[PDB]
Structures are given as C-alpha cells and as structure tokens.
Amino acid sequence: ESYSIYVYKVLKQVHPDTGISSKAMGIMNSFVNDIFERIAGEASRLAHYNKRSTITSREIQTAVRLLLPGELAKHAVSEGTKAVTKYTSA
Amino acid sequence: RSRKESYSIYVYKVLKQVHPDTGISSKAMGIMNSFVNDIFERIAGEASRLAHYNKRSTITSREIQTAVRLLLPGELAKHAVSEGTKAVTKYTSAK
Amino acid sequence: NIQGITKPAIRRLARRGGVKRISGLIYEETRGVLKVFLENVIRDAVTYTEHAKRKTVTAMDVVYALKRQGRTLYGFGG
Amino acid sequence: KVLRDNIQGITKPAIRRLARRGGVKRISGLIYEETRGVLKVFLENVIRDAVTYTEHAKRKTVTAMDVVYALKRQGRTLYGFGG
Amino acid sequence: HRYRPGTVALREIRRYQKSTELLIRKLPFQRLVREIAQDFKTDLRFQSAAIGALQEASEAYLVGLFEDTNLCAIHAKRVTIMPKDIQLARRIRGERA
Amino acid sequence: PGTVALREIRRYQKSTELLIRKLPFQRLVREIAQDFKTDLRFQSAAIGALQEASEAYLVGLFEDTNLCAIHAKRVTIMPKDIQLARRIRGER
Amino acid sequence: RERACMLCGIVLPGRVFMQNGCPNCDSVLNLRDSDQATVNECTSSSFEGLVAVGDNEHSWVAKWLRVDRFQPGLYAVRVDGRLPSDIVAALEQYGVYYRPRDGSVI
Amino acid sequence: AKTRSSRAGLQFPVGRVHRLLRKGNYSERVGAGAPVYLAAVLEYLTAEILELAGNAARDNKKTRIIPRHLQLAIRNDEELNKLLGRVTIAQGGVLPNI
Amino acid sequence: TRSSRAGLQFPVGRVHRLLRKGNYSERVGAGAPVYLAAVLEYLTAEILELAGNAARDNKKTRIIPRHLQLAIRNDEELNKLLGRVTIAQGGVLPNIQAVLLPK
DNA sequence: GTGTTTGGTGTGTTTGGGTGGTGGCCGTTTTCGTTGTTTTTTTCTGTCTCGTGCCTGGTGTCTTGGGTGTTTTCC
DNA sequence: GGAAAACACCCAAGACACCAGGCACGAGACAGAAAAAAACAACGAAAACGGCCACCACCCAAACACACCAAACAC
Ligand SMILES: [Zn+2]
C-alpha cells in the first residue's frame, strides 16, 4: 500500500505541468505514513490522558493543534473542519 | 475512597533490601514512582512496536528481552537480561 | 512582569551554572529566551486544558507538555 | 574472511569533500581522524540496533527496514528508503 | 578588607551547586506565567503545582543553557558570557535554527 | 590560496551525490557488523540508507564545527571544535 | 529512443544526453549539467535525415552541414525545434553564432 | 456518492485511513469523522508540500520533481522545516548557503 | 502471589494488568510480565543502592531528591539512561571549570 | 614569607512532624478448564546475496612551496 | 579587545599508482510461501489475601548557638 496515486491526483490538481520521480514518491509515502503515525499516536495519548476509549474529531483537532505550528495548524484545522462539515452535511 | 495504586511499598521493600539503615523522603518516593512509570512506558512502547514490526499479536519475554537489549547500556543491559532470564526460569520451573 | 525576573536572580542562575563574569545584555537575552520557552510550554498546557474542557491548569497538563518537548520532569506526580 | 581496519577506506579527500559540503574552509590535519572516530561511534551505534532487529526476527539478512527502524529509534527518520 | 573580583563569585558558585532552592522569586514568576497564559485564554486558573513545575523546568533549562554558554565562552578563550554566546549555544543545541 | 576551496564548497552544496566511496564504506560496515553477529548478510538498500544517514550526520556535524570555529574568530576547524559541538549536542 | 542535439546536429539517445551530455557542445551548452527541459531545448527526438560521418576533415558533406569540427557519429539533416531565446542570448554572450538546422532558416 | 471521499470532496482514501485507525491499536473505537478529518489534514499537508516541490522543480528548469526539490521545499519553508527538522531526505542534498 | 513464585518483589499481576489495559498488543504472553518485573526491580534496586550510598556519604539516613540527582548524574550508565530528565529539587553536581579556578 | 582575621567546617542542645508501624476492609490477583487461534513446525521454492574475476582509470596520495592565519606578546 | 610578529599548517600543484568500480557469471544460503500442528492466552468464574485507608508514636536532622579551623589578603 502506498499513496502514490493520491499524490499524483493532488499534484495534477495543484500542478498539471509537473511530474514526480519514483524517489520523490517514496519520500512522500514515508512522509504520509510518518504523519499518520505521529497524529494517531498523539490522539491515542490524548484519549488515555482523558480516560477515553474512542478517537473522535475533537481529539484529532487538538492533536493537529499540538503537532502543527501556528499558521500551519490554523490552515489544517480549517481544512479538516471544512471536510468534516461537508461530509456531515452530505 | 480513591484507591489509587503506586509503587511506594515496592520501592520501600527494595530500599530495605539494599539499604536497611536508610530512609526515603516522600518527594524522592514520588521521583521513584515517576521513574517506574516512565520505564514501564518506554519498555511497553518498544515491545509494542517490535511485536507489530514482526507481525505478532503477543508480547512475550523475547520482545521484552530485545527491547531491554535495545534500550539499556552494556553492563546494565547484561545484568538486566540475567535478572529477567533468572526470574523467568524460576517462575516457569515452579507454578 | 518579565522585569520581575531581576538581575540578581539571573545572576544566581548563572552562578549555579558556573558563570564567572556576565555581560550587560545577558539579562534581556535571558528574559527573551525564558519567555520563548515559557510561551511554548504554556501553549502546550493551554492546548491540553482546552481539550480536557477544564478551566484550571493542572500540573499534569504541564507534565504532559514537558513530555511532549522531551524535558521529562520527575517529582510532580508523573 | 574477516575485515580488519577498514576505517582508512574513508580517504582524506573523502573527508575533505564531506567538510566542504558542510561549509568548512580550512581543515586541520587532525580533523580527519577525529571525524573517523565519530563516524565509527555512530555506525557502531546504528548497526548494533539493526543487527538486534535482524536477530530478533530470527533472520540472517539485514534488511532495509531494520536500518529504517534503527535510525527512527535514534531520531534519524529517513525518507526515500521506506517509512 | 576587599576580595579580588571573582572570589566571592566562586564562593557563590560552590554555594549554589550545592543547594537546590529556587533562585527566582515565586510571585514575579507566577505573575509572568499568568501574563503569558492570558494571551491564549483569559480567566485561566493555575494549580500551585503547575506553577512549581513550570518554575523548576524553566530554571533547569536556564541552568543547562548557562552551562553550554560557559562552554562556548571558554572555547572562545574568554571568561565573560555574552548574548552572542547564548545565541550560538541555542543554535548548536538545535533550539535556535 | 582560498578560491578553489570556495569553488568546492559551491560545487558540493549544489549536489546530492554521496561523498564516501561505496565499497570501502560497505566493507567498513561489514567489519563493524562483524562484532554484533558473525557472518551477516546485508541488503544493498541497508548499506545505501546507512551511507546516506552517515553522510547527512557528518555534514551537519561539519556545519556545527564551522559555526564554532567562526565563533572563535577563526577559519580553521580543529578537533576541539568537533568535541565542543558533540558535547553541546548532548553526545556520548 | 534517440534525440538529435540541436546545436551540433549529433544524434544520440536522450538518456545518453542526460547522463553524459553532448561530447561536442558541452563547451557551450553544458547539456550534461542541464536539466531535462534544457536537454529537450537543445536535443530533439523529432528529426530527419540520419547522417553517418567517418572523416570530418575531408568529407564535403560535413563542411556543408558544418559538422566537420565535431565528433563523427549519427547526425540529422533536419531537426524539429529551435534553440530558445534565452539560450540563444547565452550563446551570443560566448561569441558563438547559432545557425538553425531546422531548414526553415537558410 | 458511495465513497466516503466523494461525500467529503477528498482525494485521499477515507476507508484506508479508517482501516489504519482500527488495525493500528490506537483506541477501542473510532468516530465517524475522525478518519475524515485526518484525511483532510493529510491531503492538505501533502498538497502544501507538493506546491513548494513543484515550485522548486520549476525554479530549476525541471519538469519532474526529484528528492532534491522535496528537500529544498522542506528546508526552505520555516514551518515545514520546523515540523520536519528530524527527517532525512534521500538524495536531497543541502541548501547552498555560504 | 506470583512475585514469590518468581522470587520477585515487584508485582506481576499489576504489571500484567497495566500491559493489558495499556493498548500495547492484542495479547500479552505470560513470560513478559515476569521478565519486566525483574528488570524494573533490578533497576530500582540499583538506583536505591546508589542513593543510599550518596545519603550515607553526607551522613544522612534518609534519601532526598538531592541524593537521587547525585546518584543519577554520577553514574555513567544511568546518567546515559536518564539523560534528558530533570529532577525537581535535585540541583547540579558541584563542578567548577579548570580555567575559572583562581591563580 | 609573615601576619591578622574573614570563611567555612565541626560541634552541641533543642523540636517536632513526618517516617514507620499497626488495625480494618474491599477489591483485585489468583486458580482453574475450556475455546479458539496465534503461534510453532516442517517442507519447498527461488531470489539475490555472496563469491569470484578482469580491466580501466577515476581516483587516491606522496610531496614540494609557501603564505596566511593561528598563537603569542604588549598595551 | 586591539595591535603586532611570525611561523609553519594546511592548501595547492603535480605526477604516479591502486583498486574501486563496473560489469559479468555462478552458486546457493536463506528467504518467502505453504501446509501442518499444538499449547497458549483469553473468558468466566469463584476466591482469598494483599494493599489500600486511618492512625498512632518516635527521633533524624532541622534548627539555633559555640567553636576551631584555615584559607585571604594585607603586609
Ligand atoms: Zn551538440
């Protein structure tokens, strides 16, 4: 399993006239896996800190707040809330 | 009331086992409890990561031993592995 | 309130750090560094507090925020 | 066959290239040995973990993932080779 | 009489590497902590142990930093620590970029 | 004296290629691994990752060493600068 | 897969041009030291008229194609595409005049 | 809209992120919008990085992004480099800085 | 008790329950908690031995955080293990640099 | 040195509250067979790692010159 | 910290040589897969004592008061 097709999708959405090497896709896959591990571990850590046995979007939001720096955290929070809001609406 | 667990009695037993004529302050007992919790967390996280690396659902003594080997320095790791193997064999021989 | 950290207190911290002679701008430099450090730690603590839906900042929040930075502290209930 | 003292395969011009990429303008003749020792201590620390992983998997070949975990354990996360 | 400058300094160094008591006044530090925290959320309350932990960590950090600063100052063949010494130490630790 | 050094700095900062020779490095790695388990096999990607990590580490260390040497108002890096860097980094 | 270097007219595989560069034009093009975009802008896979030259000095064809000062090998009579304006200016900086081999200029 | 990605307007796989959240030993249960939120964040971050990698590949007159451009994008962005200060990029090189 | 059966002082049941309820693995083998209790008991015994030595060195019969700090920072292997931890009220080791000493 | 004399360690009597021990109880470890499956086990395939070999020249390097930049000295 | 002397470390330029490097082929250990096979961990249950909470009393050393000691700086 790898995120290669999704990175192509995102790239063409962002840069139609740019291509990615195999090594750059390996790096991107490592990055995505690494970020998933960091965020999920911090969410679990939060759930245990607060004596919970479920990972809800609040835990994920505050995990993103802890991990990401100020402006990055703000933009990523906006993106996540937008996606969750539109998924709920649909 | 709030029946919360700690390692204070065990730390005290160990202290009287190594140093009979020596006491311990409450703040030092707190430090020892924090230390025990820390080492537990480190070892359990390494063992979990190792089991998941090797695609196993079980934390056995092999995982604990290799996490100890990865984590502790030479002489400390050697003595700890000796202690763990001794205790495991003594526990398994009896029941 | 950062001027409450007086020059003698910074001097005491430098002497416990083994410093024999101290320049004159070190005090402001130290106030800035401490403010940055405290800012980071308090940001993490307040994040923890808001997440736990509390209005009081506990020592556990500070301890987890220090564990987040890697500055593990013993002797406060960890 | 046993390998004996191969640290000197890190030639002096190689160490100079590593220093120049690092921004060093003038390099003391004692640097090269200093660096060599440092590198040894690093590699010995990484390899000891990689081998520890290889032996724990009851394997006989050192895989790339073993290296990746050994580096990740030291805070040396490496992108490009897995992760 | 009078001592050489630096003899009372060394007597103080010996005195402070022996003791463990906090070298900052508590109330100024508590006021500083509340002022900083007030920039993230107004009307916050702090358990006294939170302030104590914060003060311990901040002083421990500052003492380690002063040790690195002394190492840098002695490396440069000097004795007086300077803001540039602090900046270099914070950069080398990986604290300042 | 002092121009080809800047040219080499520029060249090597423009590039990514590994600076340590690959086979001497492979043999060195095998020699070091020969202590941890006798008669080991290695993946090629294991040696490649090890070489990439080692060179990145050494380049960062040389960056810090140059920083210390400049701090001392010098231009030549000496082993005590490396030692100070490893001490401040927290290395054992 | 083969491409024709626009400047000198030689034809070599595109991967060869990327890995090693043009053996003749490297003194003014730095094709090996150039990215894929510059390689394409100076080496084109669309061409016509494969030419094999054995002796540049005495071959009248080489003089007619202005390749008598280059390495013998595969050359193209006509190459699709021209050098970019920035590369043209860079070559004019070096004092070398570029004559297109596209055939549209004669 | 059968896919959870379509329902959220995303490109990353919601179902795989959910599967990873469950078969990853993080918590006994997982919400329904936690995978969605995390997928949104991950897609945003990858797009953020790919923006700068495309910029760097276009600044080097290259059509393809290589590890060099990912390294440049990461080490040139203040926030990304702070996030990714302990990550080694293979074939990423260094930044020219004298 | 399972500590007696293994000749231990640390709890095996408590450690097994903490490993069980910590979301560490799907299942936990029975030789892990005995081994881990033995290791933890050894490490705490080492710490308390050196701390008692340090407290006697000061001619005190009760261990305070200062002796913990001295024992930790004075032992090379432990100090490498606890290299990033700060001990409240632990202080620093007395250490004056060679060049600062008077002449 | 020679000298008085500030700093600091050693010593004693006094206080007390926190260390230590002991009673009461309740809850969590404990013993246990069965269930069910994650292991271990064995056997087989086959890739890639080891193993070796040849030839080229990119590279490694031994050394003379020397200058600049490091170490010392004075103020 | 600045100015001053100056020397010899390191770089720089050069020619000579090695073995890395590049590629190849061969061999096969061992890795990956498959199929087999079982004890081991989880589950419920019952079970009993350890570990918790309360409370008690003693004495280490905190504290205050004396002193000898021995470095400091003055001469
Ligand atoms: Zn050409």
Curated annotation (Swiss-Prot), chain B:
<dbReference type="GO" id="GO:0030527">
    <property type="term" value="F:structural constituent of chromatin"/>
</dbReference>
<dbReference type="GO" id="GO:0061844">
    <property type="term" value="P:antimicrobial humoral immune response mediated by antimicrobial peptide"/>
</dbReference>
<protein>
    <recommendedName>
        <fullName>Histone H2B type 1-J</fullName>
    </recommendedName>
</protein>
<keyword id="KW-0929">Antimicrobial</keyword>
<dbReference type="GO" id="GO:0050830">
    <property type="term" value="P:defense response to Gram-positive bacterium"/>
</dbReference>
<feature type="modified residue" description="N6-(2-hydroxyisobutyryl)lysine; alternate">
    <location>
        <position position="78"/>
    </location>
</feature>
<dbReference type="GO" id="GO:0005615">
    <property type="term" value="C:extracellular space"/>
</dbReference>
<dbReference type="GO" id="GO:0001530">
    <property type="term" value="F:lipopolysaccharide binding"/>
</dbReference>
<dbReference type="GO" id="GO:0050829">
    <property type="term" value="P:defense response to Gram-negative bacterium"/>
</dbReference>
<dbReference type="GO" id="GO:0005654">
    <property type="term" value="C:nucleoplasm"/>
</dbReference>
<keyword id="KW-1017">Isopeptide bond</keyword>
<keyword id="KW-0379">Hydroxylation</keyword>
Swiss-Prot record, chain C:
<keyword id="KW-0007">Acetylation</keyword>
<feature type="cross-link" description="Glycyl lysine isopeptide (Lys-Gly) (interchain with G-Cter in SUMO2); alternate">
    <location>
        <position position="35"/>
    </location>
</feature>
<keyword id="KW-1017">Isopeptide bond</keyword>
<feature type="modified residue" description="N6-succinyllysine; alternate">
    <location>
        <position position="7"/>
    </location>
</feature>
<feature type="modified residue" description="N6-(2-hydroxyisobutyryl)lysine; alternate">
    <location>
        <position position="55"/>
    </location>
</feature>
<dbReference type="GO" id="GO:0000786">
    <property type="term" value="C:nucleosome"/>
</dbReference>
<dbReference type="GO" id="GO:0005654">
    <property type="term" value="C:nucleoplasm"/>
</dbReference>
<feature type="modified residue" description="Phosphothreonine">
    <location>
        <position position="56"/>
    </location>
</feature>
<dbReference type="GO" id="GO:0032200">
    <property type="term" value="P:telomere organization"/>
</dbReference>
<keyword id="KW-0379">Hydroxylation</keyword>
<feature type="modified residue" description="N6-butyryllysine; alternate">
    <location>
        <position position="67"/>
    </location>
</feature>
<comment type="subunit">
    <text>The nucleosome is a histone octamer containing two molecules each of H2A, H2B, H3 and H4 assembled in one H3-H4 heterotetramer and two H2A-H2B heterodimers. The octamer wraps approximately 147 bp of DNA. Found in a co-chaperone complex with DNJC9, MCM2 and histone H3.3-H4 dimers. Within the complex, interacts with DNJC9 (via C-terminus); the interaction is direct. Interacts with NASP; NASP is a histone chaperone that stabilizes and maintains a soluble pool of Histone H3-H4 dimers.</text>
</comment>
From Swiss-Prot, chain E:
<feature type="modified residue" description="N6-glutaryllysine; alternate">
    <location>
        <position position="84"/>
    </location>
</feature>
<feature type="modified residue" description="Phosphotyrosine">
    <location>
        <position position="3"/>
    </location>
</feature>
<dbReference type="GO" id="GO:0031508">
    <property type="term" value="P:pericentric heterochromatin formation"/>
</dbReference>
<keyword id="KW-0164">Citrullination</keyword>
<dbReference type="GO" id="GO:0001740">
    <property type="term" value="C:Barr body"/>
</dbReference>
<feature type="modified residue" description="N6-methyllysine; by EHMT2; alternate">
    <location>
        <position position="18"/>
    </location>
</feature>
<feature type="modified residue" description="N6-(2-hydroxyisobutyryl)lysine; alternate">
    <location>
        <position position="84"/>
    </location>
</feature>
<dbReference type="GO" id="GO:0007286">
    <property type="term" value="P:spermatid development"/>
</dbReference>
<feature type="modified residue" description="N6-acetyllysine; alternate">
    <location>
        <position position="18"/>
    </location>
</feature>
<keyword id="KW-0597">Phosphoprotein</keyword>
<dbReference type="GO" id="GO:0001556">
    <property type="term" value="P:oocyte maturation"/>
</dbReference>
<dbReference type="GO" id="GO:0000786">
    <property type="term" value="C:nucleosome"/>
</dbReference>
Swiss-Prot record, chain I:
<feature type="modified residue" description="N6-glutaryllysine; alternate">
    <location>
        <position position="80"/>
    </location>
</feature>
<comment type="similarity">
    <text>Belongs to the histone H2A family.</text>
</comment>
<dbReference type="GO" id="GO:0046982">
    <property type="term" value="F:protein heterodimerization activity"/>
</dbReference>
<comment type="function">
    <text>Core component of nucleosome. Nucleosomes wrap and compact DNA into chromatin, limiting DNA accessibility to the cellular machineries which require DNA as a template. Histones thereby play a central role in transcription regulation, DNA repair, DNA replication and chromosomal stability. DNA accessibility is regulated via a complex set of post-translational modifications of histones, also called histone code, and nucleosome remodeling.</text>
</comment>
<keyword id="KW-0007">Acetylation</keyword>
<feature type="modified residue" description="N6-(beta-hydroxybutyryl)lysine; alternate">
    <location>
        <position position="103"/>
    </location>
</feature>
<feature type="modified residue" description="N6-glutaryllysine; alternate">
    <location>
        <position position="103"/>
    </location>
</feature>
<feature type="modified residue" description="N6-(beta-hydroxybutyryl)lysine; alternate">
    <location>
        <position position="80"/>
    </location>
</feature>
<dbReference type="GO" id="GO:0043505">
    <property type="term" value="C:CENP-A containing nucleosome"/>
</dbReference>
<keyword id="KW-0158">Chromosome</keyword>
<keyword id="KW-0539">Nucleus</keyword>
<dbReference type="GO" id="GO:0005634">
    <property type="term" value="C:nucleus"/>
</dbReference>
